[PDB]
């Protein structure tokens, strides 16, 4: 019902490095565009978390816009102020995220089918 | 049914500056993230076309990925090689586009509810 629950779950899993949490939230057909415009799969997307190459210290979301793409699709567009370490280097980055969630059944929930992030300039 | 029809319609409307075509394809609740991470509405998104401030000469799409966000949502992630004039200046830009289409009824079709574009680096 409320995509805020899943958005918050995702934020927590990313911030805490909860790989199992991330694996649960992301659909296996994930197509995720990264900040260089490269299209990543679920396994390539989660690799930095799984290797310990990405650790986030800050992930502050604001200005969320939510739209419906039918009863079973939800778009979330949000501003994210982030900091952490990536590939051995401290970083700070401010991004716009677009995320597309699909409704899932069996266990009633939502999973992430696609997303895009790019820097806010 | 085939989101390729609407993707191709959109490509043609953008390339030809068909403002009415664009107005038909874009939902009124459009949230579109531009290449600086700014979130635009349908009216702010179409303004450069309507003013004659953006004219495209090239819009070559490739490597399209399509995903379903239920029966009534479709995600398209595509590489776009573009050129034109914007605000009086010739430009060339290569982008990744993410587009989220919703199924519409009455006239059976699809309209764009959200999107994101960023440069491929």
GROMACS .gro file of C-alpha atoms in nm:
model
  242
    1UNK     CA    1   0.000   0.000   0.000
    2UNK     CA    2   0.235   0.280   0.115
    3UNK     CA    3   0.549   0.288  -0.086
    4UNK     CA    4   0.706   0.498   0.198
    5UNK     CA    5   0.755   0.176   0.399
    6UNK     CA    6   0.969   0.025   0.118
    7UNK     CA    7   1.154   0.353   0.046
    8UNK     CA    8   1.243   0.371   0.417
    9UNK     CA    9   1.347   0.000   0.423
   10UNK     CA   10   1.570   0.064   0.125
   11UNK     CA   11   1.726   0.373   0.286
   12UNK     CA   12   1.797   0.171   0.599
   13UNK     CA   13   1.945  -0.125   0.413
   14UNK     CA   14   2.170   0.104   0.210
   15UNK     CA   15   2.281   0.310   0.510
   16UNK     CA   16   2.350   0.001   0.724
   17UNK     CA   17   2.497  -0.222   0.447
   18UNK     CA   18   2.227  -0.482   0.499
   19UNK     CA   19   2.298  -0.700   0.196
   20UNK     CA   20   2.015  -0.946   0.268
   21UNK     CA   21   1.772  -0.657   0.309
   22UNK     CA   22   1.887  -0.517  -0.024
   23UNK     CA   23   1.856  -0.853  -0.195
   24UNK     CA   24   1.495  -0.878  -0.071
   25UNK     CA   25   1.396  -0.531  -0.185
   26UNK     CA   26   1.547  -0.543  -0.534
   27UNK     CA   27   1.377  -0.742  -0.811
   28UNK     CA   28   1.603  -0.986  -1.000
   29UNK     CA   29   1.529  -0.799  -1.327
   30UNK     CA   30   1.650  -0.470  -1.183
   31UNK     CA   31   1.786  -0.222  -1.436
   32UNK     CA   32   1.965   0.054  -1.243
   33UNK     CA   33   2.132   0.352  -1.411
   34UNK     CA   34   2.427   0.478  -1.206
   35UNK     CA   35   2.572   0.825  -1.182
   36UNK     CA   36   2.786   0.778  -1.496
   37UNK     CA   37   2.487   0.656  -1.701
   38UNK     CA   38   2.596   0.291  -1.689
   39UNK     CA   39   2.310   0.036  -1.668
   40UNK     CA   40   2.363  -0.212  -1.388
   41UNK     CA   41   2.190  -0.544  -1.303
   42UNK     CA   42   2.089  -0.644  -0.951
   43UNK     CA   43   2.415  -0.840  -0.905
   44UNK     CA   44   2.643  -0.560  -1.037
   45UNK     CA   45   2.444  -0.301  -0.839
   46UNK     CA   46   2.486  -0.490  -0.510
   47UNK     CA   47   2.850  -0.590  -0.569
   48UNK     CA   48   3.003  -0.285  -0.394
   49UNK     CA   49   2.798  -0.360  -0.086
   50UNK     CA   50   2.883  -0.731  -0.100
   51UNK     CA   51   3.258  -0.663  -0.138
   52UNK     CA   52   3.260  -0.395   0.135
   53UNK     CA   53   3.372  -0.141  -0.127
   54UNK     CA   54   3.085   0.096  -0.048
   55UNK     CA   55   2.993   0.205   0.302
   56UNK     CA   56   2.751   0.483   0.352
   57UNK     CA   57   2.762   0.721   0.651
   58UNK     CA   58   2.485   0.958   0.540
   59UNK     CA   59   2.175   0.916   0.325
   60UNK     CA   60   1.934   1.199   0.380
   61UNK     CA   61   1.627   1.195   0.157
   62UNK     CA   62   1.393   1.489   0.090
   63UNK     CA   63   1.147   1.640  -0.156
   64UNK     CA   64   1.000   1.301  -0.252
   65UNK     CA   65   0.757   1.298  -0.546
   66UNK     CA   66   0.539   0.986  -0.586
   67UNK     CA   67   0.345   0.886  -0.894
   68UNK     CA   68   0.143   0.583  -0.991
   69UNK     CA   69   0.208   0.377  -1.305
   70UNK     CA   70  -0.106   0.178  -1.260
   71UNK     CA   71  -0.225  -0.005  -0.951
   72UNK     CA   72   0.088  -0.213  -0.944
   73UNK     CA   73   0.366   0.043  -1.020
   74UNK     CA   74   0.498   0.332  -0.815
   75UNK     CA   75   0.755   0.595  -0.910
   76UNK     CA   76   0.953   0.775  -0.639
   77UNK     CA   77   1.173   1.077  -0.732
   78UNK     CA   78   1.376   1.203  -0.438
   79UNK     CA   79   1.673   1.427  -0.348
   80UNK     CA   80   1.948   1.239  -0.158
   81UNK     CA   81   2.238   1.397   0.032
   82UNK     CA   82   2.493   1.118   0.075
   83UNK     CA   83   2.841   1.058   0.221
   84UNK     CA   84   3.052   0.751   0.278
   85UNK     CA   85   3.355   0.569   0.151
   86UNK     CA   86   3.377   0.416  -0.194
   87UNK     CA   87   3.673   0.220  -0.327
   88UNK     CA   88   3.888   0.343  -0.036
   89UNK     CA   89   3.800   0.709  -0.075
   90UNK     CA   90   3.577   0.932   0.136
   91UNK     CA   91   3.307   1.097  -0.074
   92UNK     CA   92   3.015   1.331  -0.042
   93UNK     CA   93   2.755   1.334  -0.323
   94UNK     CA   94   2.409   1.491  -0.372
   95UNK     CA   95   2.188   1.297  -0.612
   96UNK     CA   96   1.847   1.274  -0.760
   97UNK     CA   97   1.707   0.928  -0.752
   98UNK     CA   98   1.423   0.793  -0.965
   99UNK     CA   99   1.296   0.455  -0.849
  100UNK     CA  100   1.029   0.234  -1.002
  101UNK     CA  101   0.864  -0.022  -0.775
  102UNK     CA  102   0.637  -0.310  -0.878
  103UNK     CA  103   0.372  -0.466  -0.658
  104UNK     CA  104   0.451  -0.823  -0.562
  105UNK     CA  105   0.211  -1.096  -0.442
  106UNK     CA  106   0.246  -1.417  -0.240
  107UNK     CA  107   0.401  -1.210   0.035
  108UNK     CA  108   0.219  -0.880  -0.041
  109UNK     CA  109   0.490  -0.620  -0.096
  110UNK     CA  110   0.683  -0.405  -0.342
  111UNK     CA  111   1.019  -0.463  -0.513
  112UNK     CA  112   1.244  -0.228  -0.707
  113UNK     CA  113   1.241  -0.297  -1.080
  114UNK     CA  114   1.437   0.005  -1.202
  115UNK     CA  115   1.609   0.317  -1.099
  116UNK     CA  116   1.835   0.601  -1.205
  117UNK     CA  117   2.062   0.829  -1.006
  118UNK     CA  118   2.250   1.137  -1.118
  119UNK     CA  119   2.419   1.426  -0.949
  120UNK     CA  120   2.229   1.744  -0.874
  121UNK     CA  121   2.417   2.038  -1.020
  122UNK     CA  122   0.047  -0.336  -2.594
  123UNK     CA  123   0.391  -0.260  -2.744
  124UNK     CA  124   0.558   0.026  -2.573
  125UNK     CA  125   0.790   0.054  -2.881
  126UNK     CA  126   0.508   0.233  -3.068
  127UNK     CA  127   0.495   0.508  -2.799
  128UNK     CA  128   0.875   0.526  -2.761
  129UNK     CA  129   0.899   0.577  -3.140
  130UNK     CA  130   0.615   0.838  -3.135
  131UNK     CA  131   0.799   1.024  -2.861
  132UNK     CA  132   1.129   1.013  -3.052
  133UNK     CA  133   0.954   1.151  -3.359
  134UNK     CA  134   0.774   1.427  -3.170
  135UNK     CA  135   1.097   1.534  -3.001
  136UNK     CA  136   1.303   1.523  -3.321
  137UNK     CA  137   1.041   1.713  -3.523
  138UNK     CA  138   0.933   1.961  -3.248
  139UNK     CA  139   0.577   1.836  -3.262
  140UNK     CA  140   0.441   2.014  -2.955
  141UNK     CA  141   0.090   1.871  -2.988
  142UNK     CA  142   0.233   1.521  -3.023
  143UNK     CA  143   0.439   1.578  -2.709
  144UNK     CA  144   0.141   1.713  -2.519
  145UNK     CA  145  -0.055   1.396  -2.609
  146UNK     CA  146   0.220   1.157  -2.505
  147UNK     CA  147   0.307   1.316  -2.170
  148UNK     CA  148   0.079   1.270  -1.869
  149UNK     CA  149  -0.019   1.592  -1.688
  150UNK     CA  150   0.142   1.459  -1.366
  151UNK     CA  151   0.476   1.409  -1.538
  152UNK     CA  152   0.780   1.431  -1.312
  153UNK     CA  153   1.090   1.454  -1.535
  154UNK     CA  154   1.444   1.476  -1.399
  155UNK     CA  155   1.670   1.669  -1.636
  156UNK     CA  156   2.042   1.639  -1.692
  157UNK     CA  157   2.125   1.867  -1.396
  158UNK     CA  158   1.899   1.669  -1.159
  159UNK     CA  159   1.623   1.931  -1.160
  160UNK     CA  160   1.266   1.792  -1.142
  161UNK     CA  161   1.044   1.936  -1.411
  162UNK     CA  162   0.665   1.929  -1.463
  163UNK     CA  163   0.499   1.866  -1.798
  164UNK     CA  164   0.467   2.242  -1.863
  165UNK     CA  165   0.830   2.324  -1.767
  166UNK     CA  166   0.954   2.019  -1.960
  167UNK     CA  167   0.775   2.124  -2.281
  168UNK     CA  168   0.855   2.497  -2.248
  169UNK     CA  169   1.179   2.484  -2.453
  170UNK     CA  170   0.994   2.320  -2.737
  171UNK     CA  171   0.703   2.565  -2.711
  172UNK     CA  172   0.935   2.869  -2.709
  173UNK     CA  173   1.151   2.734  -2.996
  174UNK     CA  174   1.450   2.732  -2.759
  175UNK     CA  175   1.524   2.365  -2.825
  176UNK     CA  176   1.549   2.214  -3.171
  177UNK     CA  177   1.683   1.870  -3.214
  178UNK     CA  178   1.873   1.755  -3.526
  179UNK     CA  179   1.969   1.407  -3.404
  180UNK     CA  180   1.810   1.162  -3.160
  181UNK     CA  181   1.949   0.816  -3.209
  182UNK     CA  182   1.827   0.557  -2.959
  183UNK     CA  183   1.989   0.220  -2.888
  184UNK     CA  184   2.034  -0.055  -2.630
  185UNK     CA  185   1.675  -0.026  -2.503
  186UNK     CA  186   1.590  -0.224  -2.189
  187UNK     CA  187   1.218  -0.274  -2.113
  188UNK     CA  188   1.069  -0.384  -1.784
  189UNK     CA  189   0.717  -0.420  -1.652
  190UNK     CA  190   0.591  -0.252  -1.335
  191UNK     CA  191   0.269  -0.442  -1.341
  192UNK     CA  192   0.026  -0.481  -1.628
  193UNK     CA  193  -0.019  -0.109  -1.652
  194UNK     CA  194   0.341   0.026  -1.614
  195UNK     CA  195   0.638   0.000  -1.845
  196UNK     CA  196   0.996   0.114  -1.789
  197UNK     CA  197   1.222   0.193  -2.085
  198UNK     CA  198   1.596   0.257  -2.028
  199UNK     CA  199   1.774   0.364  -2.346
  200UNK     CA  200   2.098   0.520  -2.474
  201UNK     CA  201   2.039   0.840  -2.677
  202UNK     CA  202   2.293   1.015  -2.900
  203UNK     CA  203   2.155   1.367  -2.950
  204UNK     CA  204   2.246   1.695  -3.123
  205UNK     CA  205   2.063   2.020  -3.182
  206UNK     CA  206   2.049   2.378  -3.072
  207UNK     CA  207   1.953   2.487  -2.723
  208UNK     CA  208   1.924   2.846  -2.607
  209UNK     CA  209   2.104   2.966  -2.922
  210UNK     CA  210   2.393   2.723  -2.895
  211UNK     CA  211   2.473   2.411  -3.097
  212UNK     CA  212   2.516   2.107  -2.873
  213UNK     CA  213   2.590   1.740  -2.892
  214UNK     CA  214   2.500   1.523  -2.589
  215UNK     CA  215   2.489   1.146  -2.519
  216UNK     CA  216   2.238   1.052  -2.250
  217UNK     CA  217   2.077   0.767  -2.071
  218UNK     CA  218   1.706   0.800  -2.048
  219UNK     CA  219   1.477   0.620  -1.804
  220UNK     CA  220   1.110   0.655  -1.889
  221UNK     CA  221   0.807   0.527  -1.702
  222UNK     CA  222   0.484   0.484  -1.898
  223UNK     CA  223   0.136   0.419  -1.760
  224UNK     CA  224  -0.141   0.243  -1.947
  225UNK     CA  225  -0.432   0.470  -2.030
  226UNK     CA  226  -0.793   0.375  -2.114
  227UNK     CA  227  -1.080   0.541  -2.301
  228UNK     CA  228  -0.851   0.570  -2.598
  229UNK     CA  229  -0.633   0.262  -2.525
  230UNK     CA  230  -0.275   0.388  -2.509
  231UNK     CA  231   0.025   0.474  -2.292
  232UNK     CA  232   0.140   0.809  -2.149
  233UNK     CA  233   0.467   0.912  -1.988
  234UNK     CA  234   0.437   0.961  -1.613
  235UNK     CA  235   0.804   1.005  -1.527
  236UNK     CA  236   1.150   1.010  -1.661
  237UNK     CA  237   1.514   1.087  -1.591
  238UNK     CA  238   1.800   1.175  -1.821
  239UNK     CA  239   2.168   1.207  -1.744
  240UNK     CA  240   2.486   1.216  -1.942
  241UNK     CA  241   2.677   0.899  -2.017
  242UNK     CA  242   3.036   0.940  -1.905
   0.00000   0.00000   0.00000
